[PDB]
Nucleic acid binder design. Structure first.
Ligand code: NA
Ligand code: NA
Ligand code: NA
Ligand code: NA
Lengths: 460, 216
DNA sequence: GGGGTTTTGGGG
DNA sequence: GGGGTTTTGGTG
DNA sequence: GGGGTTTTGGGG
């Protein structure tokens, strides 16, 4: 197998050519008719990656790759820009001024994906190590071969890929539209924004809260199975999106079966600058709290920074599998999300009780200080996406006698029967917690079969 | 101002406890929609979303009477005008019915529709399943949230708070997490169903039967 | 044998 | 090929 | 022609 560079590939031979390249863009594999699947992508290499810079505007130059197949599973799923792809038996031709490589996977063509970073996206999600630095994490057909002479080509192209993404934006301004100009687009367009929030709308759908350089916030639905790599605080490129004219309560982007959401490799200069430049926005949440009914979700809490890297566990696993799952049985501290359906005791004034640390008993302060140290004793009845349809509600405790979750309400425990200020703040919080679309993101510690909130505080 | 006629109609229906008589009257006017598909699924669009109309055995016979040279299962890419229709809520298995969400469905009951044969409609966006829309999904979740909250506040009482001693001094104490499971309502099964709206009932034809009635 | 492809009947 | 399925009609 | 396969020389 002889590999040729993109710019040196023959346009006349019309013969099968092979090559190595860096993928900067790609749609999702989509079906066209009753027997065809397609996947279009943009590739670059040392010989083709930038347009005549002088009046070009540092715009990126690239070749296109169109892979055809009879089955969905014979096409590559690009989750991240910056990775490398190896193609065999592709034919090149000029399509509207640019080099278009075509390959029929259903015939004799084949492809293989190589991770530019230490691990592939899928491997990062599962916390797996790569077999080796010469092993494809994905490829067409039942087999894939890597000759010794290829190692140099692969290793070099990786070094180049990192220099390229760290020195240039790769995804230039001409490859996407500003979110605050989305409504001016005739049809579909592309986006480059930071994921400010990942809200689990249901069993199979995630709702992404996006914000780009224009400062405009948008929401979009992202299926879990299709885009399992979405992560808060991360920057992604969305290929093919439309402005939803039917959404009045909030700005919504519509994606198609061929749309794609792609992250960037570690060395990405564009991703690095955007992660720092684009800052979280709560204007949408602040405004929604003024409406009786908000169609926008609002996360009222935030967990301590030391848990930001902790994975979440659904209520289903927390209350239905925590005593039968080997993995769940080994953990005592978990992170989860849910919404409060009801708060007990009903009387907010009884939320703070007097506690006797000697008899392990608590009592009402309606009789004053004659009960001991003041503590919070609140019992939340919660529910989530994983248990959205069942006839259950789950108890999440907020017992601070031992200091767990003492600052949850941003209000130090006190006699709510006498401290009007403290009582009023908690009453408002109570209305916000039981209000539709309000959710809680908190860490909990398992104790004697119950979950107690800790290292979590309201942010409203 | 809502541009999608279907979204606005179905939204109000849900925001009005499935009571079709409480929905704006200025919205119960004839509906001229494009037929995206006709088989195996008959789907019509309003220029933004597509919904599945449910024809009554009467509606079809009337159709076949005034239009003998027209087969319903072949109206794809054609336009129709539903002069007499109604909306009602139904409990379904969203895992099997893609035109629903959270085991709930707002059905467009068609009583009479005229096929404006060969009428070209204006270019629009690609129609999407209304039950897959972000806002409409949220609207439905709000519906269940209200029903769930009313049921829980009626079923749960007495402030049965876990005795503080159970969570305090838990060194030599072990417990099962299922102890935190609380029944939301007096529902019969393991699925929440304590809704206040009265599930609409109306005999409708299966798209398959109408297929045989026009080509055994 | 049968695909895609063009070899359009025949290799290994 | 900057696009439109479905035994897949919440990867397609 | 050449795959994978078995057809092991020949269809469309
Ligand atoms: Na042959
Ligand atoms: Na042949
Ligand atoms: Na052969
Ligand atoms: Na053979």
């Amino acid at each position: 197998y002889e590999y040729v560079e993109l710019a040196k590939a023959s346009l006349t031979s019309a013969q099968p050519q092979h090559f190595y390249a860096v993928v900067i863009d790609a749609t999702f594999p989509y079906k066209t008719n009753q027997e065809r699947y397609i996947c279009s992508l943009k590739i670059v290499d040392p010989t083709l990656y930038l347009k005549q810079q002088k009046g070009a505007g540092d715009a990126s130059d690239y070749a296109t790759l169109v892979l055809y197949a009879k089955r969905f599973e014979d096409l590559p799923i690009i989750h991240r820009a910056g990775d490398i792809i190896r193609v065999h038996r592709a034919t090149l031709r000029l399509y509207n001024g640019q080099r278009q490589f075509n390959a029929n996977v259903f015939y004799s063509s084949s492809w293989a994906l190589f991770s530019t970073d230490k691990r592939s996206v899928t491997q990062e999600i599962n916390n797996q190590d790569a077999v080796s630095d010469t092993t494809p994490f994905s490829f067409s057909s039942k087999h894939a071969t890597i000759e010794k002479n290829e190692i140099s080509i692969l290793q070099n192209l990786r070094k180049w890929a990192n220099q390229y993404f760290s020195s240039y934006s790769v995804i230039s301004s001409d490859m996407y539209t500003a979110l605050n100009k989305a409504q001016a687009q005739k049809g579909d367009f592309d986006v480059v924004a930071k994921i400010l929030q990942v809200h689990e709308l249901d069993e199979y759908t995630n709702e992404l809260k996006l914000k780009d350089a224009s400062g405009q916030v948008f929401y979009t639905l992202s299926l879990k199975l299709k885009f399992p790599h979405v992560r808060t605080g991360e920057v992604v490129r969305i290929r093919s999106a439309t402005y939803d004219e039917t959404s009045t309560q909030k700005k919504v982007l519509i994606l198609s079966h061929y749309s794609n959401i792609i992250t960037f490799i570690q060395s990405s200069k564009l991703a690095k600058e955007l992660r720092a430049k684009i800052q979280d926005d709560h204007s949408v949440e602040v405004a929604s709290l003024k409406k009786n009914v908000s169609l926008n979700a609002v996360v009222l809490t935030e967990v301590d920074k030391k848990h930001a890297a902790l994975p979440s566990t659904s209520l289903q696993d927390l209350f239905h599998h925590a005593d039968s799952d080997k993995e769940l049985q080994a953990q005592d501290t978990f992170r989860t999300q849910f919404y409060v359906t009801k708060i007990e005791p009903s009387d907010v004034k009884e939320w703070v009780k007097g506690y006797d640390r000697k008899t392990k008993k608590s009592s009402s302060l309606k009789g004053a200080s004659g009960k001991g140290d003041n503590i919070f004793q609140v019992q939340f009845l919660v529910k989530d996406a994983s248990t959205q349809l069942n006839n259950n509600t789950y108890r999440v405790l907020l017992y601070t006698q031992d200091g767990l979750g003492a600052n949850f309400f941003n209000v130090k425990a006190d006699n709510l029967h006498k401290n009007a200020d403290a009582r009023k703040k908690l009453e408002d919080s109570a209305e916000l917690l039981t209000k539709f679309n309000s959710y809680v993101d908190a860490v909990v510690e398992r104790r004697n079969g119950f979950y107690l909130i800790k290292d979590t505080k309201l942010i409203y | 101002q809502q541009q999608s006629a279907f979204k606005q109609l179905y939204t109000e229906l849900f925001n009005n406890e499935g009571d079709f008589s409480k929905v704006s009257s200025n919205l119960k006017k004839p509906l001229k929609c494009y037929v995206k598909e006709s088989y195996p699924h008959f789907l019509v669009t309003d220029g933004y979303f597509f919904v599945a109309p449910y024809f009554t055995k009467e509606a079809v016979n009337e159709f076949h009477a005034k239009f003998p040279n027209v087969n319903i299962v072949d109206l794809t890419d054609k336009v129709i005008v539903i002069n007499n229709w109604s909306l009602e809520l139904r409990r379904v298995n969203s895992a099997e019915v893609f035109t629903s969400y959270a085991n709930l469905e707002a059905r467009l009951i068609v009583h009479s529709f005229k096929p404006n044969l060969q009428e070209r409609l204006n270019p629009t966006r690609y129609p999407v399943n209304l039950f897959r829309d972000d806002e409409f999904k949220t609207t439905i979740q709000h519906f269940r949230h209200t029903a769930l909250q009313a049921a829980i506040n009626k079923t749960v009482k007495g402030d049965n708070l876990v005795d503080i001693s159970k969570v305090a001094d838990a060194a030599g104490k072990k417990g099962k997490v299922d102890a935190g499971i609380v029944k939301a309502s007096a529902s019969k099964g393991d699925e929440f169903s304590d809704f206040s709206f009265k599930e609409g009932n109306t005999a409708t034809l299966k798209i398959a039967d109408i297929f045989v009635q026009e080509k055994g």
